[PDB]
Amino acid sequence: QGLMQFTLPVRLCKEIELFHFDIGPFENMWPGIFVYMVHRSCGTSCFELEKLCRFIMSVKKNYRRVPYHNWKHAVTVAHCMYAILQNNHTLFTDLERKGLLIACLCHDLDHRGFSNSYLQKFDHPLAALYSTSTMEQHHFSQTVSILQLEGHNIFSTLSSSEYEQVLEIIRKAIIATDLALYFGNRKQLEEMYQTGSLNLNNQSHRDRVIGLMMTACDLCSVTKLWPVTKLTANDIYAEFWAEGDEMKKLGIQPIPMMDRDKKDEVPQGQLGFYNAVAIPCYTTLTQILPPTEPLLKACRDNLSQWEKVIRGEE
Ligand SMILES: Cc1nc(Nc2ncc(-c3cccnc3)c3ccc(CO)nc23)cs1
Ligand SMILES: [Cl-]
Ligand SMILES: [Cl-]
Ligand SMILES: [Cl-]
Ligand SMILES: [K+]
Ligand SMILES: [Mg+2]
Ligand SMILES: [Zn+2]
C-alpha cells in the first residue's frame, strides 16, 4: 500500500543531493521536501505517512514569525543533515537516521528570537526552570509535548527501550545546538582525532560526533552560494539588533554584533565568526567525515567573499 512514493520536479530532484541546495520561497513545498528526504535517507516504512504529516504541521505551527529562527531555518538544517547522512550512509544506525532528521526539524521550536543571555538578564521564567542551555532545553520540552499529542507518536512501532533511545538521540542533538557547548566539544574531537583515539563504536564518542554534525547543520547558511549566504545574514542580524535594542531597554550595553549602530562593522564581525567558529567547525567535521568536504569548501569561498567586501570590491 506504500505505492504512494514522493517525487520532486527535475531541478529539485537533482539539486537536493548538493550540500548548497536552497529549499526556495514556497513554504507549502517544504513538508513534501522533508518527507522525500525521510523516505530516501531512512526508508518509506520508517513512519506512518498520516502521523508524520500531522507531526510536521504541528511543528510548523509552533515555530514563530521571526526573521531567522523560523520554519525555513528548521527545514534548511534538516536538509544539511540529509546531505551528511546520504554521503556517509554506512556509518549510522536505523534509530540515528530516524532521530536526527526529526531533531533538526524540532531543534529551534518556539524560538522568540533571543539568546540564552537576554533570557538570563531579563530574568525570564525559562531561565529559572533551565539554568544552562535555556532555550535548547525549552526546544526539547516542546518536541516531547508535540510527540505526546493524540495521533502524533511517529515512533509508535518502536519498543519502550527503542523509543527511549531515539528520544535520547533527539535530546542530545538538540542540546548540542547551544553554541556555548560547541567550543569544548570541537576541542575534544580535535585532540581525539590527532591522538588516533576517536572510536565510532564508543557511544560517548558517537554523542560528540553527532553534536558536531548538529553545529555544522545549524550554521549551514555559511555553506550556501554567496547570494544565499549574504541575504540570510541580513535575517540573523535583524534578530541580533532587536535583542540589542532590548539589552539597551534593560540599561545594559549590548555586545557589538547586537548593536544596530555598529551596522558598518558587519563584514569584520563575519570575518571574526568564520575564523573563530565556522572554519574550525567544518575543518574538524571534514577530518572525521571526509565526504562532508563541500561544506568546508563553500565556507572558505564565503570567507573570501567577506574579505572582498572589507576591501570594497563587493
Ligand atoms: C561574533 C559574531 N558571531 C556572529 N554570529 C553569526 N553571524 C552570522 C551568521 C550567519 C547566518 C546566516 C548566514 N550567514 C551567516 C550566524 C549563523 C548562526 C549563528 C549561531 O548563533 N551565528 C551567526 C556574528 S558576529
Ligand atoms: Cl508568532
Ligand atoms: Cl512570548
Ligand atoms: Cl498515537
Ligand atoms: K541558532
Ligand atoms: Mg537554537
Ligand atoms: Zn538553529
Structure description:
- Belongs to the cyclic nucleotide phosphodiesterase family.
- Residues 1-313 form the PDEase domain.
- With 314 residues, the protein is mainly alpha-helical.
- It has a single domain, classed as 3'5'-cyclic nucleotide phosphodiesterase, catalytic domain (Catalytic domain of cyclic nucleotide phosphodiesterase 4b2b).
- 63% of the residues lie in helices and 0% in strands.
- The protein is built from 14 helices and no strands.
- It has helices spanning 10-15, 30-41, 49-61, 71-86, 94-106, 116-122, 125-129, 134-147, 160-175, 179-194, 203-218, 226-249, 266-288, 293-310.
- Helix 13 (266-288) packs antiparallel against helix 14 (293-310).
- Bound molecules: ligand JJR, chloride ion (3 copies), potassium ion (K), magnesium ion and zinc ion (ZN).
Please provide the ordered H/E string of secondary-structure elements.
Answer: HHHHHHHHHHHHHH
Class of secondary structure makeup: mainly alpha
CATH superfamily: 3'5'-cyclic nucleotide phosphodiesterase, catalytic domain
What is the domain total for the residues?
Answer: 1
- Ligands bound, unique: the ligand Cc1nc(Nc2ncc(-c3cccnc3)c3ccc(CO)nc23)cs1, chloride ion, potassium ion, magnesium ion, zinc ion
Number of helices: 14
The end-to-end span amounts to 54 Å
Largest sheet: none
Architecture (CATH level 2) name: Orthogonal Bundle
Number of strands: 0
Shape: globular
Q: How would you classify the quaternary structure?
A: monomer
CATH class category: Mainly Alpha
Protein name: cAMP and cAMP-inhibited cGMP 3',5'-cyclic phosphodiesterase 10A
Binding site for 3',5'-cyclic GMP: 69, 270
Domain PDEase: 1-313
Binding site for a divalent metal cation 1: 73, 107-108, 218
